[PDB]
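Hey,

Quick one before I head out. I ran the complex with nitrite ion overnight. Inputs first:
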Amino acid sequence: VLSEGEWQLVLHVWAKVEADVAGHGQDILIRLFKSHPETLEKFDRFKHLKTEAEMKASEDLKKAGVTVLTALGAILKKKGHHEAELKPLAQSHATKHKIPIKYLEFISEAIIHVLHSRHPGNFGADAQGAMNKALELFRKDIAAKYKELGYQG
Ligand code: HEM
Ligand SMILES: O=N[O-]
Ligand SMILES: O=N[O-]
Ligand SMILES: O=N[O-]
Ligand SMILES: O=N[O-]
Ligand SMILES: O=N[O-]
Ligand SMILES: O=N[O-]
Ligand SMILES: O=N[O-]
Ligand SMILES: O=N[O-]
């Protein structure tokens, strides 16, 4: 359970993300796909992309990045009261897309990497710790939902 001070660290860096959600989404998806190339295989519209340049030029990848970060943002803004948001997301990611928890860990690591690179003014150790706690909460609650839904994860 996060403190209010922890949530405020999360939401203060999130506010900078929101200055340019598309750009942050490109950087985050690209980092995930470079760091864990097996994750790209889940994305049928652009799994054929071979290079970072191709990835940066992809309008479909850009839209996916906007979608992920906007949904995550909405969850973070609930400050842990995210049961309603998590229901459809857990169902799609468990049953349609088949995203294991380990892949949710990889995208969390990609998020942290990019925020650390882009936002050293709002992403020092305490803020990174708060973001990691928020993302660990998200993953814990999604994993519990996966289990309810019948998915090993
Ligand atoms: C913070 C974690 C994540 C959030 C908030 C998120 C959110 C979303 C949302 C909102 C959509 C569109 C609606 C839906 O289908 O549910 C979506 C689609 C999808 N997500 Fe995620 N997602 C996350 C992590 C992942 C990860 C790690 C992968 C794969 C490694 C993944 C794969 C997909 C796929 C394949 C789609 C369908 C995209 C398409 O139609 O081409 N997601 N996700
Ligand atoms: O205010 N304690 O995070
Ligand atoms: O996408 N940078 O590792
Ligand atoms: O496609 N924006 O959430
Ligand atoms: O981009 N993960 O939906
Ligand atoms: O707390 N959301 O499952
Ligand atoms: O509300 N979940 O489908
Ligand atoms: O509800 N999953 O597409
Ligand atoms: O992409 N994680 O360092």
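Residues 64, 68 surround nitrite ion (ligand 5) (CB under 6 Å).

Talk tomorrow,
K.
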